[PDB]
């Protein structure tokens, strides 16, 4: 049950003037594609705060990648879901190397130890396995949404409830303008991740996906199972769990798609006019 929104004063949406004319803002299956100028964050914040929404953020920091946690967390504190309840789950092989980052009210961090695996095969499947296989009951009890991101990143601008939806992927910054035949999907029919040259909507990046706990567990379970089949069949998808994520999102359409504002690499790609904000970016 959802209470009424309060009275709010904001500019009237104008039916005969689009918010953005330079980009696709809705997919053919009627999922919003989230760009600056498409949303009023005040309305969305009201809608989600009224539900007392809790967002879980999962991040893996293994070996040398623990060095990225301090900037990742400090910038998440400035830009990610501010005003909402947030639970960070940091999965690491080095609990002692996790920095003590000061958190705002209503925000908490849990350090979760991984997990052995000397064989690279199991390391490849570790994230999908851990989100689905081992963390299932924990996430269902603690958060409403799960967001899965890479650690070698920093927040530079607002990333908030505009992304929340049953299931989302993010347009990979190297491919948003590419033809589907150029997408680096897995192309060998022997792989469960296989996508033919005449299929595909978008190329989604493994570095930022999420949705409701239920939908994220479905996605991660399916990808983990598919990866196990590939391993038994002696094949590793060209881009590992990202290849599987792409296959899954082809066959299970996401209910929102994030624009490359949400996963950008300024060193590699600069700052094109189409991006009004650079929100979450690769650390050089």
From Swiss-Prot:
<dbReference type="GO" id="GO:0005576">
    <property type="term" value="C:extracellular region"/>
</dbReference>
<protein>
    <recommendedName>
        <fullName>Histo-blood group ABO system transferase</fullName>
        <ecNumber>2.4.1.40</ecNumber>
        <ecNumber>2.4.1.37</ecNumber>
    </recommendedName>
</protein>
<feature type="binding site">
    <location>
        <position position="265"/>
    </location>
    <ligand>
        <name>an alpha-L-fucosyl-(1-&gt;2)-beta-D-galactosyl derivative</name>
    </ligand>
</feature>
<dbReference type="GO" id="GO:0003823">
    <property type="term" value="F:antigen binding"/>
</dbReference>
<keyword id="KW-0808">Transferase</keyword>
<comment type="function">
    <text>Glycosyltransferase that catalyzes the transfer of carbohydrates to H antigen, forming the antigenic structures of the ABO blood group.</text>
</comment>
<feature type="binding site">
    <location>
        <position position="150"/>
    </location>
    <ligand>
        <name>Mn(2+)</name>
    </ligand>
</feature>
<dbReference type="GO" id="GO:0031982">
    <property type="term" value="C:vesicle"/>
</dbReference>
<keyword id="KW-0464">Manganese</keyword>
<comment type="function">
    <text>This protein is the basis of the ABO blood group system. The histo-blood group ABO involves three carbohydrate antigens: A, B, and H. A, B, and AB individuals express a glycosyltransferase activity that converts the H antigen to the A antigen (by addition of UDP-GalNAc) or to the B antigen (by addition of UDP-Gal), whereas O individuals lack such activity.</text>
</comment>
<feature type="active site" description="Nucleophile">
    <location>
        <position position="242"/>
    </location>
</feature>
<feature type="binding site">
    <location>
        <position position="152"/>
    </location>
    <ligand>
        <name>Mn(2+)</name>
    </ligand>
</feature>
<keyword id="KW-0964">Secreted</keyword>
<dbReference type="GO" id="GO:0032580">
    <property type="term" value="C:Golgi cisterna membrane"/>
</dbReference>
<keyword id="KW-0472">Membrane</keyword>
<keyword id="KW-0333">Golgi apparatus</keyword>
<feature type="binding site">
    <location>
        <position position="65"/>
    </location>
    <ligand>
        <name>UDP-N-acetyl-alpha-D-galactosamine</name>
    </ligand>
</feature>
<keyword id="KW-0735">Signal-anchor</keyword>
<keyword id="KW-0095">Blood group antigen</keyword>
<dbReference type="GO" id="GO:0006486">
    <property type="term" value="P:protein glycosylation"/>
</dbReference>
<dbReference type="GO" id="GO:0000166">
    <property type="term" value="F:nucleotide binding"/>
</dbReference>
<dbReference type="GO" id="GO:0005975">
    <property type="term" value="P:carbohydrate metabolic process"/>
</dbReference>
<dbReference type="GO" id="GO:0004381">
    <property type="term" value="F:fucosylgalactoside 3-alpha-galactosyltransferase activity"/>
</dbReference>
<dbReference type="GO" id="GO:0030259">
    <property type="term" value="P:lipid glycosylation"/>
</dbReference>
<comment type="similarity">
    <text>Belongs to the glycosyltransferase 6 family.</text>
</comment>
<dbReference type="GO" id="GO:0030145">
    <property type="term" value="F:manganese ion binding"/>
</dbReference>
<dbReference type="GO" id="GO:0000139">
    <property type="term" value="C:Golgi membrane"/>
</dbReference>
<keyword id="KW-0812">Transmembrane</keyword>
<feature type="binding site">
    <location>
        <position position="242"/>
    </location>
    <ligand>
        <name>an alpha-L-fucosyl-(1-&gt;2)-beta-D-galactosyl derivative</name>
    </ligand>
</feature>
<feature type="binding site">
    <location>
        <position position="172"/>
    </location>
    <ligand>
        <name>an alpha-L-fucosyl-(1-&gt;2)-beta-D-galactosyl derivative</name>
    </ligand>
</feature>
<keyword id="KW-0328">Glycosyltransferase</keyword>
<feature type="binding site">
    <location>
        <position position="184"/>
    </location>
    <ligand>
        <name>an alpha-L-fucosyl-(1-&gt;2)-beta-D-galactosyl derivative</name>
    </ligand>
</feature>
<feature type="binding site">
    <location>
        <begin position="150"/>
        <end position="152"/>
    </location>
    <ligand>
        <name>UDP-N-acetyl-alpha-D-galactosamine</name>
    </ligand>
</feature>
<feature type="topological domain" description="Lumenal">
    <location>
        <begin position="3"/>
        <end position="284"/>
    </location>
</feature>
<keyword id="KW-0325">Glycoprotein</keyword>
<feature type="glycosylation site" description="N-linked (GlcNAc...) asparagine">
    <location>
        <position position="52"/>
    </location>
</feature>
<dbReference type="GO" id="GO:0005794">
    <property type="term" value="C:Golgi apparatus"/>
</dbReference>
<keyword id="KW-0479">Metal-binding</keyword>
<comment type="pathway">
    <text>Protein modification; protein glycosylation.</text>
</comment>
<dbReference type="GO" id="GO:0004380">
    <property type="term" value="F:glycoprotein-fucosylgalactoside alpha-N-acetylgalactosaminyltransferase activity"/>
</dbReference>
<keyword id="KW-1133">Transmembrane helix</keyword>
<feature type="binding site">
    <location>
        <begin position="60"/>
        <end position="62"/>
    </location>
    <ligand>
        <name>UDP-N-acetyl-alpha-D-galactosamine</name>
    </ligand>
</feature>
């Amino acid at each position: 049950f959802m209470v009424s929104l309060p009275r709010m004063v904001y500019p009237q949406p104008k039916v005969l003037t689009p918010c953005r004319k330079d980009v696709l803002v809705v997919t053919p299956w009627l999922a919003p594609i989230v760009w600056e100028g498409t949303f009023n964050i005040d309305i969305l914040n009201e809608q989600f705060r009224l539900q007392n929404t809790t967002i879980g953020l999962t991040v893996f920091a293994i070996k040398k990648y623990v060095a990225f946690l301090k900037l990742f967390l400090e910038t998440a504190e400035k830009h990610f879901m501010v005003g909402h309840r947030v639970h960070y789950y940091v999965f690491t092989d080095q609990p002692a190397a996790v920095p003590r980052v000061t958190l705002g009210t209503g925000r908490q961090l849990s350090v979760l130890e991984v997990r052995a695996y000397k064989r690279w095969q199991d390391v490849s499947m570790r994230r999908m396995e851990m989100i689905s296989d081992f963390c299932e009951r924990r996430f269902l009890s603690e958060v409403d949404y799960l967001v899965c991101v890479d650690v070698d990143m920093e927040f530079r601008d607002h990333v908030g409830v505009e992304i929340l939806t049953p299931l989302f992927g993010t347009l990979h910054p190297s491919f948003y303008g590419s033809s589907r035949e150029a997408f680096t999907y897995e192309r060998r029919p022997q792989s469960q991740a296989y996508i033919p040259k005449d299929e595909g909507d978008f190329y989604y990046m493994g570095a930022f996906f999420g949705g409701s706990v239920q939908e994220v567990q479905r996605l991660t379970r399916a990808c983990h199972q598919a990866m196990m089949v590939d391993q038994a069949n002696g094949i590793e998808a060209v881009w590992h769990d990202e290849s599987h994520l792409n296959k899954y999102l082809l066959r299970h359409k996401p209910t929102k798609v994030l624009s490359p504002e949400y996963l950008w690499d300024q060193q590699l790609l600069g700052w094109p006019a189409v991006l009004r904000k650079l929100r979450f970016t690769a650390v050089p």
